[PDB]
């Protein structure tokens, strides 16, 4: 088995900005090496071929050097546009097969920005269900890393939350997240005040949104 | 020059999988076409490739469940993968490459993909609104969504105003629970001042159970 490792495996700089993207093989595989770019929900673009060629209506700024175990890929000058994920993918074996390596994310670096800590109290039609969710969103900040907890009546959680963010958004270049505590209603029941606590880079002290249970 | 896939994607185990692409409009000499899969949050895999000539290499790990075929009468390339488990489950593209021009140039074209989904069972999302309040307004705009809450199996896609809401709108990653199911949220923020007049409704649709649900989305006060 011929393993293609990808490195660095994240990365975050601006538009202007010169990034070069290393991929190492195993063992050599003289210059069978190609380079994909692939966006979120879009299908992957081959982007160099044979270690060094320009696929068709690559743009200039793209290239690619290396022979045998160690290759890199080169954008000159990023465009907005260059921001995803870069695969390498490597040839061996006859018959012929394939291999991807693991993938190098390249981000925008923006502005820090703080969230917005918003809050949502379980919903009428769910109380009636026999569960209650309560739903912490944090709306358009940077960087990615955020951190959130979870206080009922002054005591706080674990294992019954879950976190979800989105990927950078194409516009503003910030991330959101949404944090979701479950409950049974019996337990839901048992407490007043739920509290969602937030940490993030952009932040000087904790902020918490409340609400207490059927005031709303 | 544009590649289409056609195929079903909802499958049971055991069944066969079959998919279609067609590439329309240069000439072309010689060719290869390739199929690639990615199961969602993970990586590429290839699958095999086929020339003009109909000579195809396969990926081992596959072979003896793969086929790959071409009808060169209208730049046509199909897949067939049979005895299909939930490992099978992906994104397929096929991958349409020739070489053109005097320096012989390889230009590369990719299917926009097809979800293929095997799964035994099925279970609806409840959909449940996160009305807009003061705890969730910020200087005229105010956030609200829609809790979709433990569907089987991913994926479910969340609209607002049946598409007529689109700026703005932050559709989750499903998490997987440790439970076995699916939940995600989606969120928008609006004008406050909308909020009296302007309607707003998510369209959760889960095709893997063929639902599709529509719900109103009303503002509270604390």
């Known amino acids: 088995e011929i393993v293609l490792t990808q490195s660095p495996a994240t990365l975050s700089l601006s538009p202007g900005e010169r990034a070069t993207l290393s991929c190492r093989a195993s063992?050599?595989?003289?210059?069978?090496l190609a380079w994909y770019q692939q966006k979120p929900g879009q299908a992957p673009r081959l982007l160099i071929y044979?270690?060094?060629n320009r696929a068709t209506g690559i743009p200039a700024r793209f290239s690619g050097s290396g022979s045998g175990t160690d290759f890199t890929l080169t954008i000159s000058s990023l465009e907005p546009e260059d921001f995803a994920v870069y695969y390498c993918?490597?040839?061996?074996?006859?018959?012929?097969?394939?291999?991807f390596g693991q993938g190098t994310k390249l981000e925008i670096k923006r502005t820090v920005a703080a969230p917005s800590v918003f809050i949502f109290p379980p919903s009428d039609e769910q109380l009636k269900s026999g569960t209650a969710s309560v739903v912490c969103l944090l709306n358009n900040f940077y960087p990615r890393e955020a951190k959130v907890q979870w206080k009922v009546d002054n005591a706080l959680q674990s294992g019954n939350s879950q976190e979800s963010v989105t990927e950078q958004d194409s516009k503003d270049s910030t991330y959101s997240l949404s944090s979701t505590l479950t409950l049974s209603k019996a337990d839901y029941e048992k407490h007043k005040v739920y509290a969602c606590e937030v940490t993030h880079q952009g932040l000087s002290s904790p902020v918490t949104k409340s609400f207490n249970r059927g005031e709303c | 020059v544009q590649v289409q896939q056609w195929g079903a994607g909802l499958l049971k185990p055991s069944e066969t999988l079959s998919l279609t692409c067609a590439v329309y409009?240069?000439?072309?000499?010689?060719?290869?076409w390739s199929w690639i899969r990615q199961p969602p949050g993970k990586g590429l895999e290839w699958i095999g490739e086929?020339?003009?000539?109909?000579?195809?290499n396969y990926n081992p790990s596959l072979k003896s469940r793969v086929s790959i075929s071409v009808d060169t009468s209208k730049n046509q390339v199909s897949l067939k993968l049979s005895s299909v488990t939930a490992t099978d489950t992906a994104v397929y593209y096929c991958?349409?490459?020739?070489?053109?021009?005097?320096?012989?140039?390889?230009?590369?074209?990719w299917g926009q993909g097809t979800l293929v989904t095997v799964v035994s069972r099925r279970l609806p999302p409840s959909v449940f609104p996160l009305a807009p309040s003061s705890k969730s307004t910020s200087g005229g705009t105010a956030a609200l969504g829609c809790l979709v809450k433990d569907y089987f199996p991913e994926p479910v896609t969340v609209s607002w105003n049946s598409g007529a809401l689109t700026s703005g709108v932050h559709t989750f990653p499903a998490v997987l629970q440790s439970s076995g199911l699916y939940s995600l949220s989606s969120v928008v923020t609006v004008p406050s001042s909308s909020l009296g007049t302007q309607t707003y409704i998510c369209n959760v649709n889960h095709k893997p159970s063929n639902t599709k649900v529509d719900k109103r989305v009303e503002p509270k006060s604390c």
């Open positions: 991958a349409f490459a020739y070489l053109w021009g005097s320096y012989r140039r390889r230009a590369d074209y």
């Open positions: 409009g240069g000439s072309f000499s010689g060719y290869y």
């Open positions: 086929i020339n003009h000539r109909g000579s195809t």
């Open positions: 063992q050599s595989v003289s210059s069978y």
């Open positions: 044979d270690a060094s």
């Open positions: 993918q490597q040839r061996s074996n006859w018959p012929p097969t394939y291999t």
